[PDB]
């Protein structure tokens with residue numbers, strides 16, 4: 001086909017990127033994270049008890065207001081590093097961009113306050129493989145591919161730095177392509193280790209000149225769902241020591257004045273060095289030697305089979321425009337802009 005649709009994304013604080021979808025006839029809109037590290041679709045359900053405050057504070061899908069709704073009702077449970085969500089399956093039509101797909105999704109009836117009380121978004125749309133879908137539900141992208149409408153069986157992500165401007169575009173995703181308004185040059189493509197996970201090999205991780213980490217190779221997941229770059233607790237501890245970074249209950253910090261002179265961090269992928277300066281990795285609120293500044297890196301030990309792995313989140317994606325290629329099982333990187 002020729003279709004290459006686009007969805008605009010909202011950037012909240014540089015930690016949440018999300019966009020709109022519509023479910024049903026007439027369409028009920030939701031804000032969703034597009035997550036390459038998961039494969040399922042869910043939104044909150046009108047059936048969610050208001051005993052869950054998250055279901056109070058977020059938008060709820062009402063099956064009964066939709067003509068295209070088809071009952072299934074099979075129980076679903078989804079696990080994330082943080083929250084666990086529960087519900088049942090429903091089928092309805094979902095619009096992304098200009099594309100309309102009949103999809104199977106979870107309607108969530110149990111949403112914990114941690115973490116969804118902290119979400120600026122309603123639900124998630126997983127962009128991962130069926131291999132990782134809970135319940136073996138066909139994921140939304142596969143269904144689109146089935147539709148046979150995209151130009152190329154790929155999708156791409158642009159993530160932006162948060163701006164004060166109203167005009168400024170927080171993010172964009174493209175279905176079936178990439179937008180070259182947002183990258184310079186040509187893509188460098190790295191093959192997936194295997195189909196079913198958006199994960200690739202990483203040669204090393206460098207703090208400065210010296211090759212400190214993942215020195216004998218490691219794994220890299222390219223995760224649009226993730227805010228920060230993540231590594232193993234061991235990998236991260238050492239990298240953090242290398243920066244003189246300090247550990248706090250939620251985050252890693254440096255004195256706000258010392259951030260600019262921190263060493264670059266390079267990720268070696270596909271034979272090329274992908275480099276983030278401290279300007280990419282410190283949230284520099286002030287430059288006071290008196291204040292402490294957050295780094296956008298943290299530890300997350302992701303268990304097997306996917307882990308241990310690094311996850312390359314928005315901190316990375318902000319620098320590098322990312323093309324996810326379903327046909328060729330490759331991920332492409334280009335310089336964002």
Ligand SMILES: COCCCC[C@@](O)(c1ccccc1-c1ccccc1)[C@@H]1CCCN(C(=O)[C@H]2C[C@@H](N)[C@@H](O)C2)C1
Nearest residue numbers: 015016017037080081082115118119224225226227314
């Ligand atoms: C760029 O947009 C980021 C959106 C926010 C992601 C997130 O920051 C978040 C913040 C506040 C409330 C909820 C959630 C959140 C929680 C669960 C699922 C989706 C979003 C997540 C915090 C927990 C760890 N981290 C992930 O493991 C990630 C791993 C990834 N695969 C996802 O499934 C979750 C990201």
Ligand SMILES: *[C@@H]1O[C@H](CO)[C@@H](O[C@@H]2O[C@H](CO)[C@@H](O)[C@H](O)[C@H]2NC(C)=O)[C@H](O)[C@H]1NC(C)=O
Nearest residue numbers: 070071072073074089090091104135136137138
């Ligand atoms: C909801 O989806 C489930 C899971 O895909 C359906 O269960 C399957 O239905 C087919 C076709 O009738 C059976 O042959 C399979 O063996 C079933 N799978 C399992 C795991 O039980 C279910 O039928 C659908 N429900 C409704 C109400 O439409």
